[PDB]
Structure 1
Amino acid sequence: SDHTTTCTDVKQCRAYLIDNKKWVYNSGRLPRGEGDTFKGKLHVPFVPVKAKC
């Protein structure tokens, strides 16, 4: 919370955000997390099935 930084410009300091309440699929277009990210699974809804055409 708060933490008023004692420096001058907004262009010389980066910022981040650590939200851990929800979880995301490991895309190839997202940066990898810090350490051990767990292997928790979601089902794939529309699987292949052998039908009649």
Structure 2
Amino acid sequence: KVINNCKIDQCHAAVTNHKNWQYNSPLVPRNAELGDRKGKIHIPFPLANVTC
């Protein structure tokens, strides 16, 4: 697309359509005011008792 009578400045662009999910780190901004959940995954390697 082409826009007439405008400078290179005063314009903003972004990519807006995604088809995958991602973990919600505190280093990335939120999608919207109330987040929508899509799934979950587990943490491996539990603890146990042993002798030394």
Work out the number of aligned pairs and report it. Answer: 50
Alignment match, 1:11:
9
> How large is the Cα RMSD of the aligned pairs?
2.3
Q: State, as a whole percentage, how many aligned pairs show the same letter.
A: 32
Name whichever structure is richer in helix by fraction. Answer: 1
Greater Rg over alpha carbons, structure: 2
Write out the 4+ residue segments of structure 1 that deviate beyond 4 Å after TM superposition.
none
Give unmatched runs, 5+ long, in structure 1.
none
Equivalents in 1 of 2:45, 2:21: separation in Å? 23
State the TM-score, normalized to the length of structure 1.
0.61
